Ligand binder design. Structure first.
Ligand code: 1KG
Ligand code: 1KG
Lengths: 430, 436
């Protein structure tokens, strides 16, 4: 059918009734095939680096050139500040990929494939037109299914830029049938020996009544650096508007008048930056329209391992593409069988397929005997302390003392990339 | 460099100066590598059919089903009117492909590759997901280089949908460096035995001074059917500053005489052709329905054969080295690979001729529509479609800018010719070399 017919269709009306008093597992609620995406959530990790030049730019800024690497302020006060500005630009550049990509490719936000445990998604940005960049690798892994958790790393060995992070959500419907989404997890970016902790924002899905879903961001994201500098990004919705403020240190963040820079605009369009309070002098900071996302290289389907997302989901995606409710169910049953047998083969080969490239670490003050614990000078702990960030499994961005942090009965388990596990990988390639 | 550095760069400042000193045409001003596109103008013909379902929809509308194939008006008065609304939707859907594709893929409008004479670009939309569609074929050919003229046909044998057209431009800069572009040519769409004449609009390239070029449509396009029905599409850049762009108003009339009076519009369509538009029937203006939302159906790109299987006349293969040099931004390699292309094509033409292969007028021929045709010219056939539909529209049959009406100032230019390029299907059926 034409999308102009979706909202008043029998299928949509039925769907709306099924969410009107929804209970249970949103991933397992039947939906009309028109609102199904063929893309799994393990693929979403790619959205952290679809502007390779922005991802790598902070690594090119040093004590001898920093004033030449701050386009909005050639009189920037320090290379640390120059690198904070570049990291903030990179972070803002990720949002359109994160939150708009399905609108562009599918026509609206849709219901993603719910990844199987052990599912992998890998590829590389070869950066062939910029040999100083070198190749950047993505590894994404579904480390939990109950509930869905995706862990990921994106790393450029040539420039010593590495990212790792994980993501999970908790979602429910409002009375108005907006889907309220809380993100959980965090991402760390290391630029040589300097680190950044990034927290994703809460969001909600609008447009469900009219069968044209889309994301609207809310709340705040943080970017806390090992240099002390802190970026606070506040999302409002005029559509997709934010404001981001950079502070000398985290304590200054209670007072906006102490912001070194203030960025405002739309994360899906243009934003401007003002230094100090010089409101009459703003410059263009980032314009998402001007810089096309660059998609990573993923190997041909013929060459993929059966754990790899697109190969694994291929028949299901075909059954979605042509709309057959029963073929969708049949192919899903077949994936469950395929994976059951594949797991047995992995275990026979001594492969920790559930914890393939990531392990889960227990940051509780007092961890359980047996648990993996953080190393002495753990980066997350140092940055979370600087930000006054909860180190518990609270929603992303929760501060110490907040309602979700005060809970006794809340774990502090976080997924961490283990590079040696990838270096020893014997099945998956790029 | 970052795009924010383009406008103040030495390169751009030099480039803007070359514009006043500009004399020649576009493919003279050498322009900096950052404002070059690696895509030839022969590929632009594909923009007429990147929504295959909308291209073919009118063929599915008949006397027994028309009220079920008119989403915005299940009480539509006739199947002819149903088909006119469908063709209008199709035409509107083309515009985002035609005018926004490079903004999307390159970050701005950029200078396309100027096609060589004889250059070809072919492909097909296989429509694998919908077997009742059948394959739709694109043939695009550069029929002139002095000046650049691209001719094209897009055809679906299964459903008897065929399109043919040609395009060329005249461009001029204003003192402020707006590029005024007049389109010339027209496009015919045949839906079984029913025909439609489509005229493209004039435009400006804005944003040159700040090195972020973009197209802004202006003026009017027409869609004149053999059924008498007429759509007039008026384009507007109103609301720039507020972030509005790409707006239009389209009105469908019983015939061209009625079109002299906006109150006689059967329907009125208004909105953004790169976004959403609504339709009102009659003047029931207190109620509208969604007509088209370009955001909801992504363009579908045609299938092109792998580079290593292309003939050396085919655009992507032909321009491959130049395209790679542009992606690298390498000025000297761009000029060197261009010089190589001219050598390659010069030799290729000699080979084509040695084998008796017409390469200059391969699938299209030029027909003289003047009352007194040049001796030896090809002339139109008895009940020519263009002549009939131009007569219904009161459109000039001369080489005036697209959409010029009989008696307009441009219709009166002295000495003006009336030569129009036409597809010759038999020439493709008998093609000696190229395949899909
Ligand atoms: C049965 C489906 C249903 O309940 O309603 C379907 C609604 C029509 C759609 C709800 C889904 O919308 C998807 C949007 C997804 C988020 C988009 C981007 C990100 C960023 C990435 O870095 C982490 C994942 C995250 C937060 C996605 C999570 C899954 C979301 C909310 C999908 C909704 C289930
Ligand atoms: C030398 C470069 C120069 O002079 O100015 C550079 C400006 C920054 C860019 C000028 C170019 O902009 C391009 C836009 C092109 C039109 C876009 C779409 C269509 C639709 C299609 O169906 C027929 C062709 C047409 C009219 C294109 C014609 C060529 C245009 C105007 C390009 C300009 C050279």
């Amino acid at each position: 059918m034409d999308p102009s017919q979706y909202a008043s269709s029998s299928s949509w009306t039925s769907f709306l009734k099924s969410i009107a008093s929804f209970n249970g597992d949103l991933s397992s609620l039947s939906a009309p095939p028109f609102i199904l995406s063929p893309i799994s959530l393990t693929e979403f990790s790619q959205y952290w680096a679809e502007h390779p030049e922005l991802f790598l730019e902070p690594s090119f800024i040093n004590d001898d050139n920093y004033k030449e690497h701050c386009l909005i302020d050639p009189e920037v006060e320090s290379p640390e500040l120059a690198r904070m500005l570049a990291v903030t630009k990179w972070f803002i550049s990720t949002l359109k990929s994160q939150y708009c990509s399905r609108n562009e490719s599918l026509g609206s936000e849709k219901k993603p494939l719910n990844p199987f445990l052990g599912e992998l998604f890998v590829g590389k940005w070869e950066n062939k037109e910029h040999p100083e960049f070198g190749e950047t690798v993505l590894l994404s892994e579904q480390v939990s299914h109950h509930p869905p958790v995706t862990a990921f790393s994106i790393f450029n060995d040539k420039n010593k830029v590495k990212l790792q992070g994980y993501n999970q959500i908790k979602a429910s419907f409002t009375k108005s049938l907006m889907l309220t989404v809380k993100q959980f997890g965090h991402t760390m970016l290391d630029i040589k020996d300097e680190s950044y902790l990034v927290t994703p924002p809460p969001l909600h899905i609008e447009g469900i009544l009219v069968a044209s879903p889309f994301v609207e961001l809310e709340g705040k994201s943080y970017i806390q650096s090992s240099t002390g500098l802190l970026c606070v990004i506040e999302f409002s919705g005029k559509k997709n508007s934010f404001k981001a403020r950079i502070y000398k240190d985290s304590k200054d963040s209670k007072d906006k008048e102490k912001a070194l820079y203030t960025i405002s605009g739309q994360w899906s369009g243009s934003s401007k930056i003002i230094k100090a309070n010089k409101k009459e002098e703003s410059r263009l900071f980032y314009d998402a329209a001007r810089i096309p996302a660059e998609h990573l290289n993923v190997k041909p389907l013929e060459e993929q391992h059966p754990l790899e997302s697109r190969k694994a989901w291929y028949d299901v995606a075909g059954a979605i593409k042509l709309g057959d409710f029963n073929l969708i169910a049949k192919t899903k049953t077949e994936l469950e069988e395929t994976q059951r047998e594949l797991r047995k083969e992995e275990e026979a080969k001594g492969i920790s397929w559930q914890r393939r490239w990531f392990k889960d670490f227990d940051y509780s003050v007092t961890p359980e005997e047996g648990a993996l614990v953080p190393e002495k000078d753990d980066t997350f702990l140092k940055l979370a302390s600087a930000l006054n960030l909860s180190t518990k499994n609270a929603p992303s961005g929760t501060l110490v003392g907040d309602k979700e942090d005060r809970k006794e009965d809340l774990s502090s388990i976080h997924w961490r990339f283990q590079r040696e596990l990838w270096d020893e990988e014997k099945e998956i390639v790029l």
